[PDB]
Design a protein around this ligand. Structure first.
Ligand SMILES: CC(C)[C@H](NC(=O)OCc1ccccc1)P(=O)(O)C[C@H](C(=O)O)c1cccc(CN)c1
Ligand SMILES: [Zn+2]
Length: 304
């Protein structure tokens, strides 16, 4: 029941992670890096031609449950990789020289909830002591100016930062994996919607990253590249100023770990449909986004 041009439920995405790996063992290995609060398997796909001591790029989707185009993009990316390897010169070099760690859905519990109960759910689905309110905002749950700004300490709010950094099994699983592979991971890319933006640090503080100049130049060329296909216009810049301040973000944390190329993508649209992006825009959205991801990849690669 899987389709790359429709939104798939978790049942179908899970089966797909198994099948796509089955059908492409020379390009994809699949592992689980942990379990969600409700016991779902946090899958990670290692996409690339296997080899000794390869550098890597890390990309996750599905941080926020209602952001369905995000989940769709990771799936799309994986097909693009496997189908074009060996035919398209750029992707062939990419997969030859590096690995993509693709985490298709981080917040699986919430994603299932958007399908079963409330399409507009954002957070995780963990319980909170002393309240009936459910969930933590995973992108306020990382150790980066944790809960200092743009975060709520109230479990009942949508930006709840949690009881403590990495209090969520999912955010902990992700941070553990990156932490264990810091030597090989060269860039971090986290996929969200909507707003049509490429964001880079900082989000938890108005301070600029050390390599701010090249990050701006990089984000700039990527949004230019993205636009060549359908004319879709992104804005870009530091998180704090480009959209709004929000501490505890995974990209800020990734950066401060030493990953110099760290980005948050906000996909289509700009509010017409918002989180409820029609399935009819899935193809065009992923297509133009592919170009920005490959532009970044090409840049990071030539900068090892
Ligand atoms: C529509 C988008 C802009 C989404 N925002 C959203 O749904 O906000 C809900 C909200 C937030 C504060 C108050 C009220 C509602 P988003 O991808 O999720 C934005 C995302 C987030 O909030 O975690 C974000 C914002 C600023 C900087 C970063 C980089 N670390 C990431
Ligand atoms: Zn989001």
């Amino acid at each position: 029941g899987h389709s790359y041009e429709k939104y798939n439920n978790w049942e179908t995405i899970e089966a797909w992670t198994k099948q796509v790996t089955s059908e492409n063992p020379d390009l994809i290995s699949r592992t689980a890096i942990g379990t969600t609060f409700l016991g779902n398997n946090i899958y990670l796909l290692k996409v690339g031609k296997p080899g000794p001591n390869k550098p890597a790029i890390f990309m996750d989707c599905g941080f926020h449950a209602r952001e369905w185009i995000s989940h769709a993009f990771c799936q799309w990316f994986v097909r693009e990789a496997v189908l074009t390897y060996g035919y398209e010169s750029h992707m062939t070099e990419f997969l030859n020289k590096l690995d993509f760690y693709v985490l298709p859905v981080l917040n699986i519990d919430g994603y299932i909830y958007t399908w079963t109960k409330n399409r507009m759910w954002r957070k995780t689905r963990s319980t909170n002591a002393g309240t009936t309110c459910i969930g933590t905002d995973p992108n306020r749950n990382f150790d980066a100016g944790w809960c200092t700004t743009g975060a709520s300490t109230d479990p009942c709010d949508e930006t709840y930062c949690g009881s403590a950094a990495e209090s969520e099994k999912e955010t902990k699983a992700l941070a553990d994996f990156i932490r264990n592979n810091l030597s090989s991971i060269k860039a971090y890319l986290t996929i969200h919607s909507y707003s049509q933006m490429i964001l880079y640090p900082y989000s938890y503080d108005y301070k600029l990253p050390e390599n701010n100049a090249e990050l701006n130049n990089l984000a700039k060329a990527a949004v230019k590249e993205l636009a060549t296909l359908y004319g879709t216009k992104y804005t870009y810049g530091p998180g704090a100023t480009t959209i709004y301040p929000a501490a505890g973000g995974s990209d800020d944390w990734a950066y401060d770990q030493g990953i110099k190329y760290s980005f948050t993508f906000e996909l289509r649209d700009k509010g017409r449909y918002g989180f409820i992006l029609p399935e009819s825009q899935i193809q065009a959205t992923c297509e133009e986004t592919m170009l920005a991801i490959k532009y970044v990849t090409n840049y990071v690669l030539g900068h090892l």
